[PDB]
């Protein structure tokens, strides 16, 4: 396909060195993040089109939902630290936005317990230095790209995906176009 | 614990004859989506209001451009027909979740799917009552010098300050907010 700067993507005026190859930002509070993940499966469809040598990274943001948003960012750090993102993503989105059973950090904890992560194992991770580092890493990455909203995706610290410049009439087509754009920017 | 500057602020220029409880929002605002779809602020405020106190909710158009203008007019229609409870969710989801709402025609579809007759909507849309209601919403925003949403005003005198409330627990937040409105109203 024809790829144009300003159309399917934009080019950062202030590129970032040492950024993840493919960096996605989300919030468990965000309805369009919910749409991206639970409905369109944007991440999975992007992964399919990348060589497996190109790693995908996903960070939570805290600028949504106040202190609970910060707790969710810490919980996402636990998920990353323990490698259980694929177990907790769906019940966290459902819990925050659909069933509205996630109202505080203790409810987040129960989701991890039900996903197979024992209470003592969750608490250990929650209070670990590795998780404190991952929280700071997520915050720093957002600040380094001057992030103001979600969902957002950056490639090689150089480009930002521009879904608004893509064909949004057909959702199957949108997803293919989105994923193909990430591929093109990465194959650089 | 109820301190000016904490849970609320006082308007330098109070508004005479303003609605008792006045909320402003935009269907384009992610923070308004949070307030309405996740926190259900309006509902919980209503539950704590004294029986003789009514809630007023207006749409603002400083975001979203021409469609923002159309959404303010659609909200007028919603108010004129009394169908706010039928269209709020699909309008919020259509603009922000699915992003299916991009024109006036898309807005109209939501009303139809919500069980509101097609001749009803078009008569309302083009009515003087709706023209008046659009101007009413615009006047109210100007009267309180509105610079952001979501926002809530009590008696044209006090503005809610959610920044001064506890956000660790969403139920605790919602109830501190609802209680503040009640304290200011009483």
């Amino acid at each position: 396909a024809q790829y144009e700067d300003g159309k399917q993507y934009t080019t950062l005026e202030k590129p970032v060195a040492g950024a993840p190859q493919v960096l996605e930002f989300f919030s468990f509070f965000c309805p369009h993040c919910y749409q991206f993940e639970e409905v369109l499966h944007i991440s999975d469809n992007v992964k399919k089109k990348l060589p497996e040598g190109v790693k995908m990274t996903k960070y939570h943001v805290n600028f949504m939902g106040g202190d609970l948003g910060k707790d969710l960012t810490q919980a996402w750090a636990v998920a990353m630290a323990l490698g259980v993102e694929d177990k907790v993503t769906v019940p966290l989105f459902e819990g925050v936005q659909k069933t509205q059973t996630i109202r505080s950090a203790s409810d987040i904890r129960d989701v991890f317990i039900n996903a197979g992560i024992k209470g003592e194992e969750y608490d250990a991770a929650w209070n670990s230095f590795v998780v404190k580092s991952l929280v700071a890493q997520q915050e720093k990455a957002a600040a380094d790209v001057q992030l103001r909203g979600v969902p957002a995706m950056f490639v090689n610290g150089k480009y930002q995906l521009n879904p608004q410049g893509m064909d949004t009439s057909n959702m199957d087509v949108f997803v293919q176009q989105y994923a193909d754009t990430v591929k093109y920017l990465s194959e650089e | 614990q109820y301190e000016d500057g904490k849970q609320y602020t006082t308007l330098e220029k109070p508004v005479a004859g303003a609605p008792q409880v006045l909320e402003f929002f935009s269907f384009f605002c992610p923070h308004c989506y949070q307030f309405e779809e996740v926190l259900h602020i309006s509902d919980n405020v209503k539950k704590k209001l004294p029986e003789g106190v009514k809630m007023t909710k207006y749409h603002v158009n400083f975001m979203g451009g021409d469609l923002g203008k159309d959404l303010t007019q659609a909200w007028a229609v919603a108010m004129a027909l009394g169908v706010e409870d039928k269209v709020t969710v699909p309008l919020f989801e259509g603009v922000q979740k699915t992003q299916t709402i991009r024109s006036a025609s898309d807005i109209r579809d939501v009303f139809i799917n919500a069980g509101i007759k097609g001749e009803e909507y078009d008569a309302a849309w083009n009515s003087f009552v709706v023209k008046s209601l659009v101007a009413q919403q615009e006047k109210a925003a100007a009267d309180v010098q509105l610079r952001g949403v979501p926002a809530m005003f009590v008696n044209g005198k006090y503005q809610l300050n959610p920044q001064g409330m506890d956000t660790s627990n969403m139920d605790v937040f919602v109830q501190q907010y609802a209680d503040t409105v009640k304290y200011l109203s009483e």
Partner: peptide, 8 residues
């Protein structure tokens, strides 16, 4: 995307 906070 659009910023979260709704000002101006």
């Amino acid at each position: 995307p659009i910023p979260f906070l709704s000002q101006k």
